Structures are given as C-alpha cells and as structure tokens.
C-alpha cells in the first residue's frame, strides 16, 4: 500500500525518516576507525610522544 | 593482510645490487592460491 502523506497531517502520521547504523566486527582487520590527535612538536624538553 | 612490493632499474637479472618496496594498503581476508599475468596486444580479440 502506498503513504498518503499531507501537511495537514499531526506529528504521528507525518513523514518520518529514520536510519539505522549497525556495526560489524568479523575476524576481518578494522578498516574504519574514528579520528584522533592533539599539537605540540614540543623541543629541548623531555616530553611524553 | 595484503603484501605486493616493486622497483624499476635501468640494466635479464644482472650481477647488481637492489631492494624492492611494499606499494599498496589493501587489508583483504583471501586464501590466495592463484597467479595470472595480463598481457596486451593490437590483434584486438
């Protein structure tokens, strides 16, 4: 059957879209990984690199 | 976890010395057990 969206609609009938994200962890090597860094190139100072 | 390396020298293998270098990044879960080599020609088949 077919949706009879209109904007006279209220707010449970109304177009809603929706998405699904789904994680996948096979035995395979991660390929997406998240971002991270910070900036210091710190000298003549022993620091944590 | 992938592995192909290459080099390119101006000389069959000669008495010379040279390394080879890893050219790609191409993570792929294969129990690759296959070798082909692709030619090319003019004759148009």
């Known amino acids: 059957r077919s949706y009879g969206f209109r904007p006279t609609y209220g707010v449970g009938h109304q177009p809603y879209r929706v998405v699904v994200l789904s994680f996948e962890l096979l035995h395979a090597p991660a390929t997406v990984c998240g971002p991270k860094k910070s900036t210091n190139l710190v000298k003549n100072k ?3 690199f | 976890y992938f592995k192909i390396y290459s ?11 040279s390394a080879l270098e ?3 990044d191409l993570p792929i879960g294969i129990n690759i057990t296959r070798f082909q080599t692709l030619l090319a020609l003019h004759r148009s088949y």
Request: aromatic fraction near 6%; include cysteine; hydrophobic fraction near 35%.
């Open chain 2, 7 to 17: 080099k390119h020298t101006p000389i069959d293998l000669p008495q010379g010395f």
């Open chain 2, 22 to 24: 890893p050219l790609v």
């Open chain 1, 46 to 48: 022993c620091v944590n």
